[PDB]
Amino acid sequence: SHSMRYFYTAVSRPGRGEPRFIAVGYVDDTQFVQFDSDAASPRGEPRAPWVEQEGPEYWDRETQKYKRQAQTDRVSLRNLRGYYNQSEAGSHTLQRMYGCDLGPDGRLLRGYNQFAYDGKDYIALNEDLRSWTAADKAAQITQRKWEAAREAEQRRAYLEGTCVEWLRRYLENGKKTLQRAEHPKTHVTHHPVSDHEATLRCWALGFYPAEITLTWQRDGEDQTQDTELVETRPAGDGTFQKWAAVVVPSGEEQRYTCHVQHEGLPEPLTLRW
Amino acid sequence: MIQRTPKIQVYSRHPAENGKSNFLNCYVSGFHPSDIEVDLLKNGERIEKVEHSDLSFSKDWSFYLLYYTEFTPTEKDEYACRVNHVTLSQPKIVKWDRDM
Amino acid sequence: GADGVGKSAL
C-alpha cells in the first residue's frame, strides 16, 4: 500500500503580522515538497529527486496553490476566533491533513481530509467522503457552510482521481527509491545496572519504510508490558531508527530474545545477546 | 487549547566512530503549539550552521522537527541538545549518549 | 500535486 499525504499548518500571531502558513507533502515516508509563507522567497520547493525534474511550469503551479491556500487559511483562522468568542490577542493554530491511499492492488483504497483547531479535532470528512463529523457547536457552523456549498463533493473529486494520478506518477518517477524496502541493520547491547540487574537493548537502524515492530521475549513469551520503546526516529538520509530495551536479572540474559518484523525482512528476525 | 511538551532524542545518523565523519541529530516530537527553539551544543557552546527539517505533525496533531549537523566525533568531545518551549520553565538539555 | 482551495473557508 502506497500513499500521498499533505500536512498544512497555519499559526496566528496578533500584533506581529499575518498568520504564517507551512505545507509539506509526502509519498509514503519520503517528503517531496515544502512551502513556508515566511520563507525568504515563498515558493514550492523540492525535497526529493523524483520531483526536481518536473519543470518550472509544475513548480509555478504548486507555488500558486500554496499562496492561495495560505490566504484562505488566514480567513479560516479569523472565522474560528469568532465562533469561539476568543480574544483578538491570542495566537491560534489551524492544521489540516489530506491525501489518498493506493491499496495493494494499485487502486484507490482510501482518502481522507481532516482539520484540527489548537491541537484538537475540529471537523473531518468521514470515510465515505460524503458526510462530516464535527467535534462541537463551532464545528457545526463549518459543517452547515460546507454541506450547503457541496464542499465534500469537490474534495472527493480531488481525492478520487487527481490525488491518485499524481501518486501513481510519483511512484513511477521515483521507483528506484520509493518501491524498495531497506531491511533493518540490527544488534544488541548490554548495560549492567546494579549488582543483579542489567539492560538489554535491541537496535534497528537504516530501515525503510518507517513501520516496524520490536518485541522482547523471555523463554519464547512476549513481554509487552516491561519493554521500553522509543519513538521511531529519522536518521536524516531517508531511513529510520528504533530501539527496545528490557531490564533483566543478571545471569538470565540468555533467556531473552528480540524479535524484529519489517517489510524488508523475508522472515522475522530473532536476536540474542 | 493543547499544550504538550516535546520528547527529545539526541543521536547520530550512523554508529559513531572516532575520526569518521557523521551527522548529529536532535529529534523533537510530540509538542504543541509549534513554536520551539532547538540548539545543538559542542562542549557547552552553541553550534553554528545547524539545519532543520520542515514543520510536520503526527496523526495525533503533535508536531515534530529534526535538527542536524555534520560532525566528526572524537573521544572527549561532548555534545548536547538544548530545547526551549512554552511548556518548559527552563531550557531542557539532553546530552548525547553514544554507547546506548 | 496539491489540492486547490475549496468552496469556502472554515
Coordinates of C-alpha atoms in Angstrom, one line a residue:
Chain A
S1 CA 0.0 0.0 0.0
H2 CA 1.3 3.4 -1.0
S3 CA 0.0 6.9 -0.1
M4 CA 0.4 10.6 -0.8
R5 CA -0.3 12.9 2.2
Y6 CA -0.2 16.6 2.7
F7 CA 0.2 18.4 6.0
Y8 CA -0.8 22.1 6.5
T9 CA -0.2 24.3 9.5
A10 CA -1.3 27.9 9.9
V11 CA -0.5 29.9 13.1
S12 CA -1.7 33.3 14.0
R13 CA 0.4 35.9 15.8
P14 CA -1.6 39.1 16.5
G15 CA 0.4 42.2 16.7
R16 CA 3.2 40.7 14.7
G17 CA 1.9 40.4 11.1
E18 CA -0.4 38.0 9.5
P19 CA -0.6 34.2 10.1
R20 CA 2.2 32.0 8.8
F21 CA 1.4 29.1 6.6
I22 CA 3.5 25.9 6.2
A23 CA 2.8 22.9 3.9
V24 CA 4.7 19.7 3.4
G25 CA 3.9 16.7 1.2
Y26 CA 4.9 13.0 1.5
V27 CA 4.9 9.9 -0.7
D28 CA 4.8 7.1 1.9
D29 CA 7.5 8.1 4.4
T30 CA 9.5 10.3 1.9
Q31 CA 9.0 14.0 1.9
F32 CA 9.0 15.6 -1.6
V33 CA 7.7 19.2 -1.2
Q34 CA 7.6 22.1 1.3
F35 CA 6.2 25.6 1.4
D36 CA 6.6 28.3 4.0
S37 CA 4.9 31.7 3.7
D38 CA 7.7 33.2 5.9
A39 CA 10.5 31.9 3.7
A40 CA 12.9 34.4 2.2
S41 CA 11.3 33.7 -1.2
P42 CA 8.0 31.9 -0.6
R43 CA 7.6 29.1 -3.2
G44 CA 7.1 25.4 -3.6
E45 CA 10.4 23.7 -3.0
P46 CA 11.6 20.1 -4.0
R47 CA 12.6 17.7 -1.2
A48 CA 13.1 14.6 -3.4
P49 CA 15.0 13.8 -6.6
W50 CA 12.0 12.5 -8.5
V51 CA 10.3 15.9 -8.4
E52 CA 13.4 18.0 -9.2
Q53 CA 12.8 17.2 -12.9
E54 CA 9.2 18.2 -13.2
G55 CA 9.8 21.6 -14.8
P56 CA 9.2 25.2 -13.9
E57 CA 5.6 25.1 -15.0
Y58 CA 4.7 22.5 -12.5
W59 CA 6.5 24.3 -9.7
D60 CA 4.9 27.6 -10.6
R61 CA 1.5 25.9 -10.3
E62 CA 2.2 24.4 -6.9
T63 CA 3.6 27.7 -5.7
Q64 CA 0.3 29.5 -6.7
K65 CA -1.8 26.8 -5.0
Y66 CA 0.0 27.3 -1.7
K67 CA -0.2 31.1 -1.8
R68 CA -3.9 30.9 -2.4
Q69 CA -4.4 28.3 0.4
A70 CA -2.4 30.5 2.8
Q71 CA -4.8 33.4 2.3
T72 CA -7.9 31.2 2.8
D73 CA -6.3 29.7 6.0
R74 CA -5.9 33.3 7.3
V75 CA -9.7 33.8 6.8
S76 CA -10.4 30.5 8.5
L77 CA -8.3 31.5 11.5
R78 CA -10.3 34.7 11.7
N79 CA -13.7 32.9 11.5
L80 CA -12.7 30.4 14.1
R81 CA -11.8 33.1 16.6
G82 CA -15.3 34.5 16.2
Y83 CA -17.0 31.1 16.6
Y84 CA -15.4 30.6 19.9
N85 CA -15.7 34.2 21.1
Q86 CA -11.9 34.3 21.7
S87 CA -9.9 37.4 22.3
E88 CA -8.1 39.1 19.4
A89 CA -4.7 38.9 21.2
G90 CA -4.2 35.2 21.5
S91 CA -2.3 33.1 19.0
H92 CA -4.1 30.1 17.5
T93 CA -3.2 27.1 15.3
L94 CA -5.1 25.5 12.4
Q95 CA -3.9 22.2 11.0
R96 CA -5.1 20.1 8.0
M97 CA -4.1 16.7 6.7
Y98 CA -5.4 15.1 3.5
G99 CA -4.4 12.5 1.0
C100 CA -5.1 9.2 -0.7
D101 CA -4.1 5.6 -0.2
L102 CA -3.3 3.4 -3.2
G103 CA -4.3 -0.1 -1.9
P104 CA -2.0 -3.1 -2.6
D105 CA -3.5 -3.9 -6.0
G106 CA -2.9 -0.3 -7.1
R107 CA -6.5 1.1 -7.0
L108 CA -7.8 3.9 -4.7
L109 CA -8.5 2.3 -1.4
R110 CA -8.9 5.3 0.9
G111 CA -9.0 9.1 1.1
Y112 CA -9.2 11.5 4.0
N113 CA -9.4 15.2 4.8
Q114 CA -9.2 16.3 8.5
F115 CA -8.8 19.5 10.3
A116 CA -7.8 20.4 13.9
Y117 CA -8.0 23.7 15.8
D118 CA -5.4 24.4 18.5
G119 CA -4.3 20.8 18.5
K120 CA -7.8 19.3 18.9
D121 CA -10.1 17.6 16.3
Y122 CA -12.4 20.2 14.7
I123 CA -14.0 18.8 11.6
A124 CA -13.3 15.7 9.4
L125 CA -14.5 14.2 6.2
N126 CA -16.0 10.8 7.1
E127 CA -14.7 7.7 5.4
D128 CA -17.4 7.8 2.8
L129 CA -16.2 11.2 1.7
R130 CA -19.8 12.5 1.7
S131 CA -20.6 13.5 5.3
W132 CA -18.8 15.4 8.1
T133 CA -18.1 14.8 11.7
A134 CA -18.0 18.0 13.8
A135 CA -16.4 18.0 17.3
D136 CA -18.6 20.8 18.8
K137 CA -21.1 23.5 18.1
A138 CA -18.5 25.8 16.4
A139 CA -17.6 23.0 14.0
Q140 CA -21.3 22.6 13.3
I141 CA -21.2 26.1 11.8
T142 CA -18.5 24.9 9.4
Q143 CA -20.4 21.7 8.5
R144 CA -23.5 23.7 7.7
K145 CA -21.5 26.0 5.4
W146 CA -19.7 23.2 3.6
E147 CA -22.7 20.9 3.1
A148 CA -24.8 23.7 1.6
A149 CA -21.7 24.6 -0.6
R150 CA -21.2 21.0 -1.6
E151 CA -17.6 21.1 -0.3
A152 CA -17.4 17.3 0.2
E153 CA -18.1 16.6 -3.4
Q154 CA -15.3 18.8 -4.6
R155 CA -12.8 17.2 -2.1
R156 CA -13.9 13.7 -3.2
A157 CA -13.3 14.7 -6.8
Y158 CA -9.8 15.6 -5.9
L159 CA -9.1 12.6 -3.5
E160 CA -10.5 10.3 -6.2
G161 CA -8.6 10.6 -9.4
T162 CA -6.4 13.7 -9.1
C163 CA -4.7 12.7 -5.9
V164 CA -4.4 9.1 -7.3
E165 CA -3.0 10.3 -10.6
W166 CA -0.2 12.4 -9.1
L167 CA 0.6 9.5 -6.7
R168 CA 1.0 6.9 -9.5
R169 CA 3.2 9.3 -11.4
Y170 CA 5.4 9.9 -8.4
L171 CA 5.8 6.2 -7.8
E172 CA 6.9 5.6 -11.4
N173 CA 9.4 8.5 -11.5
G174 CA 10.9 7.5 -8.1
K175 CA 10.6 3.8 -8.5
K176 CA 14.3 3.2 -7.6
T177 CA 13.8 4.6 -4.1
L178 CA 10.0 4.5 -3.4
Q179 CA 9.3 0.9 -4.4
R180 CA 12.2 -0.5 -2.4
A181 CA 12.3 -1.6 1.2
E182 CA 15.5 -1.5 3.1
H183 CA 15.7 -4.0 5.9
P184 CA 16.9 -3.0 9.4
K185 CA 20.5 -3.5 10.4
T186 CA 20.3 -4.9 13.9
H187 CA 22.4 -5.5 17.0
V188 CA 22.0 -6.0 20.8
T189 CA 23.9 -4.1 23.5
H190 CA 24.2 -4.9 27.3
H191 CA 24.4 -2.5 30.2
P192 CA 24.9 -3.5 33.8
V193 CA 22.6 -1.6 36.2
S194 CA 23.2 -2.9 39.7
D195 CA 24.8 -6.0 41.3
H196 CA 21.8 -8.0 40.0
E197 CA 20.1 -6.1 37.1
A198 CA 21.1 -5.4 33.5
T199 CA 19.6 -3.7 30.5
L200 CA 19.4 -5.4 27.1
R201 CA 18.8 -3.0 24.1
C202 CA 17.7 -4.3 20.7
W203 CA 18.7 -1.9 17.9
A204 CA 17.2 -1.4 14.4
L205 CA 19.0 1.0 12.1
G206 CA 18.7 2.2 8.5
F207 CA 15.3 0.7 7.6
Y208 CA 12.6 1.9 5.3
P209 CA 9.6 2.4 5.4
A210 CA 9.3 3.6 9.0
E211 CA 6.8 0.8 10.1
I212 CA 8.5 -1.8 12.3
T213 CA 7.8 -4.0 15.3
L214 CA 10.5 -4.7 18.0
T215 CA 9.4 -7.1 20.8
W216 CA 11.4 -8.7 23.6
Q217 CA 10.6 -12.3 24.6
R218 CA 11.5 -14.4 27.7
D219 CA 11.7 -18.1 27.1
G220 CA 9.6 -17.5 23.9
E221 CA 6.8 -15.5 25.6
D222 CA 6.4 -11.9 24.5
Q223 CA 6.8 -9.2 27.3
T224 CA 5.0 -6.1 26.1
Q225 CA 4.4 -4.5 29.5
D226 CA 8.1 -4.4 30.6
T227 CA 9.6 -3.3 27.3
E228 CA 10.8 0.3 26.9
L229 CA 10.3 1.5 23.3
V230 CA 11.4 4.8 21.9
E231 CA 9.5 6.5 19.1
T232 CA 10.9 5.7 15.7
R233 CA 13.2 8.4 14.6
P234 CA 14.6 9.7 11.2
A235 CA 18.2 9.1 10.5
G236 CA 18.4 12.1 8.2
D237 CA 19.2 10.1 5.0
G238 CA 15.6 8.9 4.4
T239 CA 15.8 5.9 6.7
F240 CA 14.7 5.3 10.3
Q241 CA 15.9 4.0 13.6
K242 CA 14.3 2.4 16.7
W243 CA 15.3 0.5 19.7
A244 CA 13.7 -1.5 22.5
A245 CA 15.0 -2.2 26.0
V246 CA 14.3 -4.6 28.8
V247 CA 15.8 -4.8 32.3
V248 CA 16.6 -8.4 33.1
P249 CA 18.0 -10.3 36.1
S250 CA 21.8 -10.7 35.8
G251 CA 22.6 -14.3 34.9
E252 CA 19.4 -14.7 32.8
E253 CA 20.4 -12.7 29.7
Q254 CA 20.3 -15.9 27.5
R255 CA 16.6 -16.4 28.3
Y256 CA 15.7 -13.3 26.3
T257 CA 15.3 -12.8 22.5
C258 CA 14.5 -9.7 20.5
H259 CA 12.0 -10.3 17.6
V260 CA 12.1 -7.9 14.6
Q261 CA 9.4 -7.6 12.0
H262 CA 9.7 -5.4 8.9
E263 CA 8.6 -5.3 5.3
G264 CA 12.2 -5.8 4.0
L265 CA 12.8 -9.0 6.0
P266 CA 11.8 -12.3 4.3
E267 CA 11.3 -13.8 7.7
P268 CA 11.0 -12.3 11.2
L269 CA 14.4 -11.9 12.9
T270 CA 15.3 -13.4 16.3
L271 CA 18.3 -11.9 18.1
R272 CA 20.1 -12.9 21.3
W273 CA 22.9 -11.3 23.3
Chain B
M1 CA -6.1 24.7 23.8
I2 CA -3.5 21.9 23.9
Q3 CA -0.1 22.4 25.5
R4 CA 2.2 19.3 25.1
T5 CA 5.9 19.1 25.9
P6 CA 8.5 17.8 23.4
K7 CA 10.1 14.4 23.6
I8 CA 13.8 14.9 22.8
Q9 CA 16.2 12.4 21.3
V10 CA 19.9 13.1 20.6
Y11 CA 21.8 10.6 18.4
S12 CA 24.0 10.2 15.3
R13 CA 22.9 9.1 11.9
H14 CA 25.4 6.2 11.9
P15 CA 27.1 4.3 14.7
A16 CA 29.7 6.8 16.0
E17 CA 33.3 6.0 15.3
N18 CA 36.1 8.4 16.3
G19 CA 37.6 10.2 13.4
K20 CA 34.9 9.3 10.9
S21 CA 32.5 12.0 9.6
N22 CA 28.9 11.6 10.8
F23 CA 25.7 13.5 11.5
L24 CA 24.5 14.6 14.9
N25 CA 20.7 14.6 15.2
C26 CA 18.3 16.2 17.7
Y27 CA 14.7 14.9 17.1
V28 CA 11.9 16.8 18.9
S29 CA 8.4 15.4 18.7
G30 CA 5.1 15.3 20.3
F31 CA 4.8 19.0 21.1
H32 CA 2.1 21.7 20.8
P33 CA 2.0 24.5 19.9
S34 CA 4.6 24.7 17.2
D35 CA 6.9 27.5 18.3
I36 CA 10.1 25.9 19.6
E37 CA 13.8 26.7 19.8
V38 CA 16.4 24.0 19.5
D39 CA 20.2 24.3 19.7
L40 CA 23.0 21.8 19.2
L41 CA 25.9 22.2 21.6
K42 CA 29.6 21.3 21.3
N43 CA 31.4 21.3 24.6
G44 CA 28.6 23.5 26.0
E45 CA 28.8 26.1 23.2
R46 CA 26.1 26.6 20.6
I47 CA 27.0 25.1 17.2
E48 CA 26.6 27.3 14.2
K49 CA 25.2 26.3 10.8
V50 CA 22.6 23.8 12.2
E51 CA 20.0 22.8 9.7
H52 CA 16.5 21.6 10.4
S53 CA 13.6 19.8 8.7
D54 CA 10.3 21.4 7.7
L55 CA 7.5 21.6 10.3
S56 CA 5.3 18.5 10.1
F57 CA 2.9 16.7 12.5
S58 CA 1.7 13.2 13.5
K59 CA -1.7 11.6 13.4
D60 CA -2.4 13.0 16.9
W61 CA -1.6 16.5 15.5
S62 CA 1.5 17.0 17.6
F63 CA 4.5 18.5 15.8
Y64 CA 7.9 17.1 15.1
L65 CA 11.2 18.5 13.7
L66 CA 14.7 17.2 13.1
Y67 CA 17.8 19.4 13.8
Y68 CA 21.1 18.1 12.4
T69 CA 24.7 19.0 11.7
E70 CA 27.7 17.2 10.2
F71 CA 30.4 16.3 12.7
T72 CA 33.3 14.0 13.3
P73 CA 33.1 12.5 16.8
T74 CA 36.2 12.2 19.0
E75 CA 36.9 10.6 22.3
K76 CA 36.4 13.6 24.6
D77 CA 34.1 16.0 22.7
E78 CA 30.8 16.4 24.4
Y79 CA 27.6 17.2 22.5
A80 CA 24.1 18.0 23.6
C81 CA 20.7 19.5 22.5
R82 CA 19.1 22.5 24.2
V83 CA 15.3 22.8 23.7
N84 CA 13.0 25.7 24.9
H85 CA 9.2 25.5 24.7
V86 CA 6.2 27.2 26.2
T87 CA 5.8 24.1 28.5
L88 CA 9.3 24.4 29.9
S89 CA 10.0 27.0 32.6
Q90 CA 13.7 26.4 31.9
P91 CA 15.5 25.2 28.7
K92 CA 15.9 21.5 28.8
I93 CA 19.2 20.0 27.9
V94 CA 19.7 16.3 26.8
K95 CA 23.3 15.2 26.4
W96 CA 24.4 12.8 23.6
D97 CA 24.9 9.2 24.8
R98 CA 26.7 7.3 22.0
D99 CA 27.1 4.0 23.9
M100 CA 23.4 3.1 24.1
Chain C
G1 CA 0.1 17.8 -6.9
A2 CA -1.7 19.6 -4.1
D3 CA -5.4 20.2 -3.8
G4 CA -6.9 23.5 -4.8
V5 CA -8.8 25.7 -2.4
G6 CA -12.5 24.7 -1.9
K7 CA -15.9 26.3 -1.8
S8 CA -15.3 28.3 1.4
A9 CA -13.1 28.9 4.4
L10 CA -13.9 27.1 7.7

